[PDB]
Design a protein around this ligand. Structure first.
Ligand code: CA
Ligand code: CA
Lengths: 218, 210
């Protein structure tokens, strides 16, 4: 089994992917995390921006030049098409890695591929259990009323007595290139969770997010 | 017509801008024109001394369940109070950012909608409507629908989380069920900022800095 790492990074309009973090641009961490994992064969950055592509090429990553608020699937399908045409080796699985998740390491990627193999999953998605579990939330009805999202008794039943609810952190998406091509979407069946902490689930959007992560890092 | 405020009680006495945490919820209830009397359901002499100091009336409870504290309070009110109260306004002492205005707007909605229950909520930054539920085989699928984690927020129905600041219900309905109404429940929506529930000392520190 051969895996390819795909890192999707666009340009500014906040140019977050190139923001410095402990002396390496944000995207650098995710390229290095991918490159440092023994299961990853090649690392590709789909970018529409010169600075992202030059940084990427500087760290030994291969640039997928992307054309012109585009769909995320249309980016993966383009990447799959580019890989089919420009690469000799057939890749089994794609490891989609968001450049704004610097706290997701090579170990996380390793453990997520190990689970994708062990469970023989169609899809592995990196998740976290929120502090306020969605399993005890309420859903707004058409009349304006509210009732339990899981069941009517759920907001009142304790956490232990209810099934685990997860939120995606967007750090890792491990899937089969062949299945994705068939559907033109992510697998809706045999989807398994790779559970990470709420701490490790940091998604840099603002400079306060970046500052918290600069501090966190020690 | 008539509403009674019930505040169920080391966190509750923690100082916040010169008043113990419970003081804020006591004052918020007392400052609302729709609230007739304010009680603090507590099993500690130090909390009951502070509560009485801030003009709240103490319901002395025996030295854990939330419903057992609501029904005890209802029983105490039946026996020790002459006036019959229609609705109970349950107010958590760990929600100091919930004001008399919030309580007012909450009761105004309980009346306007003619609800059986009104619960103070907030729309989380990560909507529960786009979350995943763990199956028995170990697999995961959308909590609302299988397509939900992939459908955009706008195209999906509003999911709320309770902040626990306000629970407006009928004393007569809760007595017969021995639980909260499961029908005609309406949401009173507050911000994620106003939804602060003091648990840790970092939570208090963040609330002081406001
Ligand atoms: Ca781990
Ligand atoms: Ca308001």
């Amino acid at each position: 089994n051969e895996y390819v790492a795909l890192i999707t990074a666009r340009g500014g309009s906040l140019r977050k992917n190139v923001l410095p973090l402990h002396g390496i641009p944000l995207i650098g961490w995710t390229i290095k995390a991918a490159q440092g994992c023994s299961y990853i064969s090649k690392v590709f950055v789909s970018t529409d921006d010169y600075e992202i592509a030059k940084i990427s090429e500087g760290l030994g990553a291969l640039v997928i030049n992307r054309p012109e608020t585009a769909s995320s699937i249309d980016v993966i399908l383009h990447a799959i098409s580019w890989l089919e045409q420009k690469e000799v080796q057939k890749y089994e699985g794609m490891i989609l890695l968001q450049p704004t998740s610097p706290l997701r390491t090579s170990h996380h990627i390793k453990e997520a591929i190990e689970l994708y193999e062990k469970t023989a999953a169609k899809f592995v998605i990196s998740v976290f259990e929120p502090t306020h579990t969605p399993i005890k939330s309420y859903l707004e009805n058409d009349d304006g009323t509210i009732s339990g999202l899981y069941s009517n008794e759920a907001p009142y039943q304790r956490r232990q007595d209810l099934p685990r609810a997860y939120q995606p952190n967007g750090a890792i998406y491990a899937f089969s290139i062949d299945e994705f091509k068939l559907n033109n979407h992510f697998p809706r069946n045999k989807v398994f969770p790779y559970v990470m902490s709420e701490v490790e689930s940091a998604d840099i959007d603002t400079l306060e997010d970046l500052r918290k992560v600069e501090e966190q890092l020690k």
